[PDB]
């Protein structure tokens, strides 16, 4: 059985940036921010909260750090772990935190007194953390295909795709998505209409980016991609399962990186971490609602 946790090496300006590193009582232990996933929370978004519940930040999560595993009464303990910016607060003591300290990494790194939380953190320091975020999405579940020849232009989400729409929007504001892009499906535009309402922004349409188009022009799909990431702000581009994963193969090839995880459910996310217009992390998120 696992017990299923998220955190984070929450960072700030004083690597150089300094890192917190806290305190529990109960444990007397020095740890990295984290805590077990509430129902129906995907990592992290739980990330997010357990980080502004122990600490008093709030924050923006970036690239993902790995995973670590350890035996506890329930089973298995699972922690993933973000990098994550914060973005303001303050830390009060209390009976489950008593002391948060703010380090460097090298200082940091004799602070956390866990093996595992010490390889996290020499993940954090081997690339950029100040990242910029593309947000790769393929939609919801919308049914199945007709027996028609191309691919049902018109063909909505299912019940099911619309809870995956609705639970997308916690999950994208985590990484904190600015701008909204889909490509020319309904299907498409409908997995990121939850989040256009609640950012109050319109969704771009996106017709070179259809499997259709894609399969014609691939270069056009690949050009415009990188058009879309050097906008400004944190785009959200929700397309097609014949799209994704040769653009993401594509990109991961030209800038060297390796996912660490790897799939193309509908309502996955890949989260795409830039630095200086250059791609330092691809990191493969399941859909909302599997676990
Ligand atoms: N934070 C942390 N605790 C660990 C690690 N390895 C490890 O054996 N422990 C120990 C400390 C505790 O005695 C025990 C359970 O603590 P926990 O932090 O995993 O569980 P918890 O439910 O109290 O805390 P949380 O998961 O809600 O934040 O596991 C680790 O890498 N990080
Ligand atoms: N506070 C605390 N620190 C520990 C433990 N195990 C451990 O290796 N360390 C590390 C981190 C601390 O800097 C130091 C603990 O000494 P002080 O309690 O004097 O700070 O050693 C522990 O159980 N408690
Ligand atoms: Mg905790």
């Given at each position: 059985?696992?017990?299923?946790?998220?955190?984070?090496?929450?960072?700030?300006?004083?690597?150089?940036?300094?890192?917190?590193?806290?305190?529990?009582?109960?444990?007397?232990?020095?740890?990295?921010?984290?805590?077990?996933?509430?129902?129906?929370?995907?990592?992290?978004?739980?990330?997010?909260?357990?980080?502004?519940?122990?600490?008093?930040?709030?924050?923006?999560?970036?690239?993902?750090?790995?995973?670590?595993?350890?035996?506890?009464?329930?089973?298995?303990?699972?922690?993933?772990?973000?990098?994550?910016?914060?973005?303001?607060?303050?830390?009060?003591?209390?009976?489950?935190?008593?002391?948060?300290?703010?380090?460097?990494?090298?200082?940091?790194?004799?602070?956390?007194?866990?093996?595992?939380?010490?390889?996290?953190?020499?993940?954090?320091?081997?690339?950029?953390?100040?990242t910029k975020t593309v947000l790769?999405?393929?939609?919801?579940?919308?049914?199945?295909?007709?027996?028609?020849?191309?691919?049902?232009?018109?063909?909505?989400?299912?019940?099911?795709?619309?809870?995956?729409?609705?639970?997308?929007?916690?999950?994208?504001?985590?990484?904190?998505?600015?701008?909204?892009?889909?490509?020319?499906?309904?299907?498409?535009?409908?997995?990121?209409?939850?989040?256009?309402?609640?950012?109050?922004?319109?969704?771009?349409?996106?017709?070179?980016?259809?499997?259709?188009?894609?399969?014609?022009?691939?270069?056009?799909?690949?050009?415009?991609?990188?058009?879309?990431?050097?906008?400004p702000g944190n785009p959200?581009?929700?397309?097609?399962?014949?799209?994704?994963?040769?653009?993401?193969?594509?990109?991961?090839?030209?800038?060297?990186?390796?996912?660490?995880?790897?799939?193309?459910?509908?309502?996955?996310?890949?989260?795409?971490?830039?630095?200086?217009?250059?791609?330092?992390?691809?990191?493969?998120?399941?859909?909302?609602?599997?676990?």
């Amino acid at each position: 059985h696992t017990v299923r946790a998220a955190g984070a090496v929450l960072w700030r300006d004083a690597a150089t940036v300094e890192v917190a590193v806290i305190h529990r009582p109960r444990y007397d232990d020095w740890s990295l921010p984290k805590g077990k996933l509430d129902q129906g929370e995907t990592e992290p978004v739980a990330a997010a909260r357990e980080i502004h519940e122990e600490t008093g930040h709030t924050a923006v999560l970036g690239r993902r750090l790995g995973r670590v595993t350890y035996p506890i009464p329930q089973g298995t303990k699972r922690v993933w772990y973000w990098a994550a910016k914060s973005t303001g607060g303050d830390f009060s003591p209390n009976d489950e935190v008593d002391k948060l300290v703010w380090l460097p990494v090298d200082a940091a790194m004799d602070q956390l007194q866990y093996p595992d939380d010490r390889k996290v953190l020499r993940r954090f320091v081997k690339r950029p953390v100040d990242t910029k975020t593309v947000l790769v999405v393929r939609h919801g579940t919308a049914g199945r295909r007709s027996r028609y020849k191309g691919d049902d232009r018109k063909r909505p989400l299912d019940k099911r795709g619309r809870a995956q729409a609705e639970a997308l929007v916690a999950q994208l504001m985590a990484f904190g998505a600015t701008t909204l892009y889909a490509a020319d499906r309904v299907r498409c535009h409908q997995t990121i209409e939850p989040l256009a309402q609640e950012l109050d922004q319109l969704i771009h349409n996106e017709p070179l980016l259809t499997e259709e188009a894609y399969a014609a022009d691939h270069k056009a799909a690949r050009k415009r991609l990188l058009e879309i990431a050097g906008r400004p702000g944190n785009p959200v581009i929700c397309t097609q399962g014949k799209v994704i994963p040769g653009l993401i193969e594509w990109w991961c090839e030209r800038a060297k990186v390796r996912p660490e995880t790897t799939g193309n459910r509908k309502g996955s996310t890949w989260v795409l971490s830039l630095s200086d217009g250059e791609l330092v992390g691809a990191d493969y998120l399941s859909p909302p609602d599997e676990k």
